[PDB]
Amino acid sequence: GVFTFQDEYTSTIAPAKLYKALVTDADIIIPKAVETIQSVEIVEGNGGPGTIKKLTFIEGGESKYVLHKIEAIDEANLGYNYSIVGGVGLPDTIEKISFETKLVEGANGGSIGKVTIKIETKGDAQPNEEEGKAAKARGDAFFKAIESYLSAHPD
Ligand SMILES: COc1ccc2[nH]cc(CCNC(C)=O)c2c1
Ligand SMILES: COc1ccc2[nH]cc(CCNC(C)=O)c2c1
């Protein structure tokens, strides 16, 4: 099956500066800002499409990682697309999960962060609702931590 999900986040922060933190300078900023993420590193590639990044994080007290493959990166248009290509544990019935993200101008010089998630499953399997809830919350917390960090570090 094929399933879509969307979420949106608002910030008082300007979109180009949020995108620099989230994407350009992600390998430095994300582990500083996000207290459950230990590291974000390039496993292979030059930063462009095809690049594989490894995000190491703690969950339930246990060290885990996930691998992200960069699918599109467009700084001019504040766009970044990636799919999950590996990690700890099993996908179970999840064949594929990709993300499409964009930042746009929001209220009073601020931003809106838009994320579209596309999940492909085996046959008639449905995406797990408890894991969806957890993912949704993680996304919220992630975007919020980045905002906190940038605010606490004017520039
Ligand atoms: C969670 O909210 C958003 C919103 C707009 C976004 N743009 C770019 C990213 C970063 C995507 N990097 C990772 C490791 O997921 C993003 C996140
Ligand atoms: C609360 O922040 C966290 C904590 C652990 C994590 N592992 C992986 C991600 C990336 C999350 N990116 C998006 C677009 O949802 C992550 C975020």
Ligand code: NA
């Ligand atoms: Na961290």
